[PDB]
């Protein structure tokens, strides 16, 4: 039956890839069996509302000149040259916090916090004037080893039953400087991980795990692990909003993004009344057409394959966007061509259903718009991996 | 007579533009009158030797993340991307000094000094392990206001009868952040100059003058004044080597460079035996031809009009060097063209002497090579100003 099926699509994903908890999924299944379409749709819409309305506030504290402002621009996927991005080299020194919303996901805000050092208030008033209660978790950055200042902040955070994370930036510079001129014969990474703990263990018991990374190289070292760790500690419903905002550094992250978005499509489709009508018949409406345009540009912006991000492969090899656009099939979706869109989308739907079935029990179907979303999602995901390969060979 | 004339060319320059002191010029004039060509030439060659052999060691101390490493690359005229330049963002943290010679003037070495803060030794051993006696003068950098650490270093420097200079970097970021969003109605510069003194005056009496500048904008604010101030405090004979290494930020600096080089040409010409032979006759030798090539590429590298620096106008407007080379007459000197070089240099000499005479009393002349140097020097200087205009309109 339908209740059985909706429950199961959630099962093909991993336990850490759940867009919604098992507590609510069983609540939706229960309502569905009741037969009251009103309450069922409402519960699903509420779940979607909870996810979409979910706000994440990340507080970042750290000594000057470590890479925390560049760390803000890194996760946001923004260069250190833009005006909307955090000032990457220069430091504010306002004793005043400044928020930074994600360019694509406004519900994601990063806070650059003044180091306790150079604050003009006793740490008792430091934390209060900060308003740290509002944040979901803390990120602690240090360019070298973590000093007492940073450590004392950590202890307070741990004491308040909140999560914190130590981030050691500029690891690339250490390896380069230490290795420079020496023979070919990952020792630097091991020395730094101990050095951070050596200062920790001196005053602070039970040194926590520390992540060594480089804001200039998001794809290597412990950068991937940190993102994975942050999501797991976050509440189930909060993972969705944060996940899509993360940098597309690997195929795993890209695929993970696809998986979450796939579940949201499933949810959205179910929130809408199901039908007995097979898609790919007659023509689509302008309203549903515009909704696909908004959904498409949303998927493209998340996987960094949007026209704005298409500006940044043009600089990698000095190659115009058109040339970059040819590799991927994303931009060539809403392009005015002789081959109408009403006849083009009619083609996408047929290929998808023949290869993947209708995803639902016989005689039951999702609205046409939802099947197109799965197709686009798959298309953009594949494009992200294709674009990724070209990116990795350079720089 | 000849003694009278050699003395006078030095007089047409400013008192602060003297490549050599009045104490030695009078020594050269005395020897000349004696008639002993041996001692006279030797004295001049010694003067040239003293200047050329002159070594300058600049120690730079400062708290982390102010712009002192970028300050090293700024004066050297090197980007923050090169390997030979000081690591511009990242910080060494080796508790160990590192030298940086000028790319064109090896006798100019900049030292990035670890802040007293984070040194593991008492300041009594700090100064000693530093070996600060070797430096001619100190540059003190601070990204905001100067702390007790910096101030105590300053007091010790002042106490040792040595010159020091306070440099406040990143002033551009302060003005931008403070002005951001506000109406059109130089207040920021006045507030910072007092803030530096406010911390100074608290413990340190007689606040010294402080220079506000930006490593991202060498041409504006107090950057020009600092260079002028540094040279004046330096010993006469040491000015030459440092001057030519300085960034070509203004016409005044470029003209000043020309003036010093003009005096050196004069000296070099006099060190060589003078003749009764007029130049621009017959043909030049390959040895003198090669000497002109070395002297030309030397002048071009100083005024930043060399082929290496010609790479950096190509990025300003995305314009190939050839296009940049057309504006200036520097690169088109040693280009294989139908119009031989033996006939080309024969043209430069005639135009120069007709417009500027022989610079010496009747029947007396400098060697041909020296007149060509004056011509090239003038040509390169004019090219520097021409190139400067194109640079200033952009960025
Ligand atoms: N090699 C390397 N350099 C880095 C890294 N992160 C930052 N930097 C360097 O440090 C500068 C960035 O300073 P910034 O990020 O503002 O420091 P911060 O950690 O944000 N703290 P603050 O906000 O006090 O400055 C840049 O000039 C850049 O060269 C990194 O991961 N690797
Ligand atoms: N706006 C602005 N930013 C600057 C200036 N100087 C440096 N910066 C910024 O700060 C970083 C440079 O750090 P750096 O120069 O190494 O600091 P420093 O003063 O050399 N001291 P240290 O050697 O300890 O780092 C760059 O990322 C750059 O954005 C300046 O004059 N203006
Ligand atoms: Mg910041
Ligand atoms: Mg929490
Ligand atoms: Mg340095
Ligand atoms: Mg001195």
Residue numbers in the entry:
A (entry chain A), B (entry chain A): 15 to 199, 203 to 356, 358 to 413
List sentences quoted exactly from the publication behind this structure:
A combination of four of these mutations (R31E, K32E, K176E, and K246E) essentially eliminated GTP-dependent assembly and allowed crystallization of Irga6 in the presence of GMPPNP. Crystals diffracted to 3.2 Å resolution and displayed one exceptionally long unit cell axis of 1289 Å. The asymmetric unit contained seven Irga6 molecules that were arranged in a helical pattern along the long cell axis. Strikingly, molecule A of one asymmetric unit assembled with an equivalent molecule of the adjacent asymmetric unit via the G-interface in a symmetric parallel fashion via a 470 Å2 interface. This assembly results in a butterfly-shaped Irga6 dimer in which the helical domains protrude in parallel orientations. In contrast, the other six molecules in the asymmetric unit do not assemble via the G interface. In contact site III, G103 of switch I interacts via its main chain nitrogen with the exocyclic 2’-OH and 3’-OH groups of the opposing ribose in trans, whereas the two opposing exocyclic 3’-OH group of the ribose form hydrogen bonds with each other. Via the ribose contact, switch I is pulled towards the opposing nucleotide. In turn, E106 of switch I reorients towards the nucleotide and now participates in the coordination of the Mg2+ ion. E106 was previously shown to be essential for catalysis, and the observed interactions in contact site III explain how dimerization via the ribose is directly coupled to the activation of GTP hydrolysis.
